[PDB]
Design a protein around this ligand. Sequence first.
Ligand SMILES: Cc1cc2nc3c(=O)[nH]c(=O)nc-3n(C[C@H](O)[C@H](O)[C@H](O)COP(=O)(O)OP(=O)(O)OC[C@H]3O[C@@H](n4cnc5c(N)ncnc54)[C@H](O)[C@@H]3O)c2cc1C
Ligand SMILES: Cc1cc2nc3c(=O)[nH]c(=O)nc-3n(C[C@H](O)[C@H](O)[C@H](O)COP(=O)(O)OP(=O)(O)OC[C@H]3O[C@@H](n4cnc5c(N)ncnc54)[C@H](O)[C@@H]3O)c2cc1C
Ligand SMILES: Nc1ncnc2c1ncn2[C@@H]1O[C@H](COP(=O)(O)OP(=O)(O)OP(=O)(O)O)[C@@H](O)[C@H]1O
Ligand SMILES: Nc1ncnc2c1ncn2[C@@H]1O[C@H](COP(=O)(O)OP(=O)(O)OP(=O)(O)O)[C@@H](O)[C@H]1O
Ligand SMILES: [Mg+2]
Ligand SMILES: [Mg+2]
Lengths: 657, 661
Amino acid sequence: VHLNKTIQEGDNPDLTAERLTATFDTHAMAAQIYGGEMRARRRREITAKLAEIPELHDSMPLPYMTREEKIMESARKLTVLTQRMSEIIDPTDAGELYHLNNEVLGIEGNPMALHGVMFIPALNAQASDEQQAKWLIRALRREIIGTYAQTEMGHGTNLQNLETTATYDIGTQEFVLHTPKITALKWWPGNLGKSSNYAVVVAHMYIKGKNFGPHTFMVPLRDEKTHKPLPGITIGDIGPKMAYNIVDNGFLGFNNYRIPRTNLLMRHTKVEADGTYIKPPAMVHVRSYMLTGQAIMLSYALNIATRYSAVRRQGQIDKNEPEVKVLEYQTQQHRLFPFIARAYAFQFAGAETVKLYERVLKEMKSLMADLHALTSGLKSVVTHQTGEGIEQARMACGGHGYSMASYISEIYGVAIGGCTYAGENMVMLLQLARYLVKSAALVKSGKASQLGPLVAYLGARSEPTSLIDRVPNGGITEYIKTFQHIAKRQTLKAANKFFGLMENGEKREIAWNKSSVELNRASRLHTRLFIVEAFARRVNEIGDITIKEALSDLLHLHVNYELLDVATYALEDGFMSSTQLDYVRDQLYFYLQKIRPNAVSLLDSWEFSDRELRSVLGRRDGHVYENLFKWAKESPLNKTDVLPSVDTYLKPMMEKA
Amino acid sequence: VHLNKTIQEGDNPDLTAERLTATFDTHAMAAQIYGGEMRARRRREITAKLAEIPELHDSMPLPYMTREEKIMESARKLTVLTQRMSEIIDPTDAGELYHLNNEVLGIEGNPMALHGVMFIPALNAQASDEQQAKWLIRALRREIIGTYAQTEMGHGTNLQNLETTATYDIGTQEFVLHTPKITALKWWPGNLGKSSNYAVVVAHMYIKGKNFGPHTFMVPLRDEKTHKPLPGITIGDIGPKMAYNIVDNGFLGFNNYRIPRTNLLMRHTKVEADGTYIKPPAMVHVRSYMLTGQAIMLSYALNIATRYSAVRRQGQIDKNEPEVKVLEYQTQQHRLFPFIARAYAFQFAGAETVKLYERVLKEMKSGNVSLMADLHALTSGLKSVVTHQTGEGIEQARMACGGHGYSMASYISEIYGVAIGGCTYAGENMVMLLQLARYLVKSAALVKSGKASQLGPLVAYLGARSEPTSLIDRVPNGGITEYIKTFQHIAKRQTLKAANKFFGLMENGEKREIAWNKSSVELNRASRLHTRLFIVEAFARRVNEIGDITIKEALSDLLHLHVNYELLDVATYALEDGFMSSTQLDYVRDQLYFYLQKIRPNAVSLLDSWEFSDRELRSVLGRRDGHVYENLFKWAKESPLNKTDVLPSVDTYLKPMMEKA
Ligand SMILES: Cc1cc2nc3c(=O)[nH]c(=O)nc-3n(C[C@H](O)[C@H](O)[C@H](O)COP(=O)(O)OP(=O)(O)OC[C@H]3O[C@@H](n4cnc5c(N)ncnc54)[C@H](O)[C@@H]3O)c2cc1C
Ligand SMILES: Cc1cc2nc3c(=O)[nH]c(=O)nc-3n(C[C@H](O)[C@H](O)[C@H](O)COP(=O)(O)OP(=O)(O)OC[C@H]3O[C@@H](n4cnc5c(N)ncnc54)[C@H](O)[C@@H]3O)c2cc1C
Ligand SMILES: Nc1ncnc2c1ncn2[C@@H]1O[C@H](COP(=O)(O)OP(=O)(O)OP(=O)(O)O)[C@@H](O)[C@H]1O
Ligand SMILES: Nc1ncnc2c1ncn2[C@@H]1O[C@H](COP(=O)(O)OP(=O)(O)OP(=O)(O)O)[C@@H](O)[C@H]1O
Ligand SMILES: [Mg+2]
Ligand SMILES: [Mg+2]
């Protein structure tokens, strides 16, 4: 058997050659990627089981379809999926369901996408025990379809200025929902337009004229039998989008729509029947769990671009040798491999974040602040660097990347949306910047010892100079220490600019605005430091020497590519020299060439079947050209030879001349 | 009147407020953008004329349509367009045709997009006088539909290894075109799949077994009356794409398809009837003229993002004042305004490039191809930097609209998909940057060997001597020259540094081409800096040509924002050798944030100065009048998925699924 477990007989030999050079077992790397040998094996067992159920396969290639056709296809697969789920899956294994959906439903959306991502989690986090019994069970059994309705046409970021109102009628004992203007329409909740018949709905709660602020409510939207909008409801789709068009993102409006008092979600907060209010002592779920989604989507795109790079030949290096694999050019390795490093790094960073999400929550029955800040920065950097890498992966396929035969353009449209959902990236970076400024005030005021673990480096003292290419035994610790220095220096520098403008008389919020770009520079460096450290932490946890060396090579590529990308900050104070920067450059180009024989195996280790990956250029077997010709020939515009546009128009136009 | 000529009564006052602060006449800035007052006025006159012809309007909003519906809509407008063109336009000055097409046909494509972009230019540049009479006239009159077929399924970059063959039969006096394998299929030529009935076709020419390399041929593809494929022709669409889906990009295959000898394009090469060859003494057209296309598409996206930023309120700065325009936050100004600077810079750089394209070509009747090399290298780098930085900016503009930007009501996502395609067409960006790098390495060998005086004007700075230190924030001068000199220093230093690494590996024994590959990433760093320097210098040159003081000050503010944003983005190269200090870099930072706030009251006018009507711009968020929310609610309500209340997906599937539980 081969160390690379994806080789099959008959595969394109140009691609097999790249798998044959693997130094590690791809099953063992999968276990690392997916958090356990068991987890990885279940992925493969699910994939092998779905191969025997053709009902759950793409009835035709998805890029052939109109929006209407895709929505029908998705619901077709979903009904079959919900019926047969237990034959394939442990429904309670949130991990198995995610993979099952990726193979069967894919990334473009489905009618119950929000049902899982937010509707159920909102019920877990905010409904009382009695209410969970009424609604959460019906949701889990898929008796109803639900979503989470927070954003409105005129507000998504702010929320203290939402316009939908829930006014408590003390007699009758109902909440009266009302949408006073068009801008108060709920707007963007996924699966709200056509699919959901219930929603959790954020609205400003009014009692005795007093505004208690945003609160969440269970709201029936459509009749459970005919699916018509209940009286007082205005509801529909918000139209087509950049991507993710299978989800029916919706608008929702209320004309004095009454719900029971008990529709207010009361695990935290109560409104008694007379009107009395009792105060208690997320959205954070989405940010914590979306990081794998981005890593995975980045890995989709790199699997395709790197596989295609092994089969695509183009140009000569040596004039007496044949055309080389484009994978041969340093320019091509340089535009792919740093992103393979990033995809592993994002995965490992996401595992630590999910652990921290579970660690708070557990402790919540003084660390939510640290989690909110980490997640704020990480969601913004990961999403932005993923987009950069996906698009580099598309363009690395040449002309054909622009075709939907690559599928990378759809991977891009869906992944990039995470720059805006779950918190605008600019806003989430400034959210982290507030935490970093608080931390900088601790340092400046002598309370350095009160810094939490994630931000203690801001209190540490820097050595004069950075010991890259100095201390014997080139270690990743001198790179970590260099990242720490530049992130601390920019954090304290940006903070002090802010403090200095207030000291000089400017209002807090105007000084904040004037320093906000600088402050986002700090957030970004602090977060990019976190990704490095998480990557290095995993490399050191591993005992299997072949796996450890493979990921260690990747880590070395990571720290040199990233440090070079931020070299400006290392040079400003002379922390780094010209000579150390040329060392980082030569190291970057060295580790490109080191990684190459493993590049395809490092991506095969994610173990995406063709039915998941949906790419012709990225076919597991490497037989691109023949299947690309078929895919073109079978596409909808080639049904007829001479188009209606040519008969109706165009031919008459030519005749007239 | 108002200095800003786009204000109309009834407009959203949040947006009007931003136009009222203009310091210059937007008609006068249009003249600067489009190269003359007359040209700019014609744009507006064309727009006013098209308002009286509703037949040429989007029959319904384009994002509502399937691919099939859009293609039908495009040909509908095209037929009307070709019949009524003379009523609106001077067909020969075009130019006006480019703008007419932008309003009527838009960016997503049309059946005759490549008819203009490449088919006709190929006939101008490569057909003899006799052949132009046969084919170019029919093309201009739109008697035929044509395209340019170079790329194949297996080769786009490496033309030397194309697989389609044209073998000369000496008897019969024909060329025999043949497609020996699937990978030899022509693949990607726009409008080839369904619309064109003729094409210019690049193929390796064989005579008596000898391969003379790529040559271009006029090739009839479909019957002029039935539009069926002529015998021996395999032809169709290559399928849907990231964007630009109205163009039917095609595949084309030949089974020993014979064309006359005289179908070889013979303005420069000849093949006589017996077989005799005779050697002569582009694609460069596309690269030269596509730069405005990118500038314009960048300006579309910024018009939308900045207009929407004036009407979108969100959050408080001062806690006792109402929610602010998002166009107030420094992060928002920082994510838009540098790209406004870039869009002007690309336009001005594109005008100088088109002048150089005309200046060679003009000189190519005499000697005199000793300037094609300078043009090819400039165009190689510029097409790569402009296209890549445009994409960065378009996407920043989309995300500056928040959630709604992701909707097609913004239209920026389509602007993005179409514009970014230019990172790959007309030369892969990585390949075109290395094409420039060859020219820079040749130039570095002149310097190293003492022939500095032989450097052409565009690359003479590589021979100049640098001062010790860069005089930004040191020495007053009337603005910008110390920034230019700093850009020159870092671009020269990286060029000579990357070149010497290449020379050093050969000196140590590596083969030329392996040393090249090993230095290629570094070499593209040089290309990029040299090109980004050119854009600065072109921008500064235009600022100094202008006499109208208000216009000059407005563009001067933009130029200052440009040089500080770009220099900061490349600061690594300025700091490495101590050319710049920490303190000068903090000056560049403070300058960047200053010029953001300086530019703001002009931001919306600088974009209105491009003078894109709503029918051109196609954005709900970007409406000239600023009435976003009401027209966004309508746009959603009228979209195709809201025709019915309960979807078929709910009746067929989904409702049964719920019942079963
Ligand atoms: C929207 C779009 C429209 C198009 N329209 C037309 C048309 O109308 N007519 C026509 O003929 N073609 C058309 N094309 C095709 C286009 O010309 C080619 O796709 C383009 O030239 C890229 O070449 P390629 O496809 O062979 O990419 P490839 O060369 O196959 O792959 C490029 C990758 O390999 C690398 N690479 C390749 N060669 C080298 C080298 N020497 N050195 C270093 N790296 C290298 C690059 O780094 C890049 O990452 C279109 C393409 C697109 C996307
Ligand atoms: C694919 C997609 C899916 C979505 N799914 C859901 C869903 O499922 N459920 C749901 O409830 N909502 C959903 N939304 C809406 C989403 O939550 C909001 O769009 C997102 O949170 C951003 O808020 P916004 O639209 O108001 O951005 P805006 O505030 O309108 O941003 C516009 C510009 O203003 C900037 N800006 C805003 N505030 C500040 C500030 N204080 N300081 C500096 N700059 C600022 C922003 O950085 C941005 O550049 C979705 C949106 C998208 C695109
Ligand atoms: N003109 C371009 N078109 C497409 N992609 C590009 C272009 N220039 C750079 N890239 C990509 O951006 C990534 C960064 O490469 P590189 O660091 O050499 O360029 P840069 O960061 O833009 O310049 P520098 O790092 O020298 O400031 C690479 O993946 C490269 O492929
Ligand atoms: N996390 C992010 N998500 C989306 N866009 C971003 C993000 N960070 C930066 N940008 C965009 O990149 C552009 C450049 O700004 P900036 O220089 O602050 O970012 P950067 O270059 O990545 O950071 P630095 O300059 O410190 O390396 C800005 O216009 C901004 O909109
Ligand atoms: Mg870089
Ligand atoms: Mg920057």
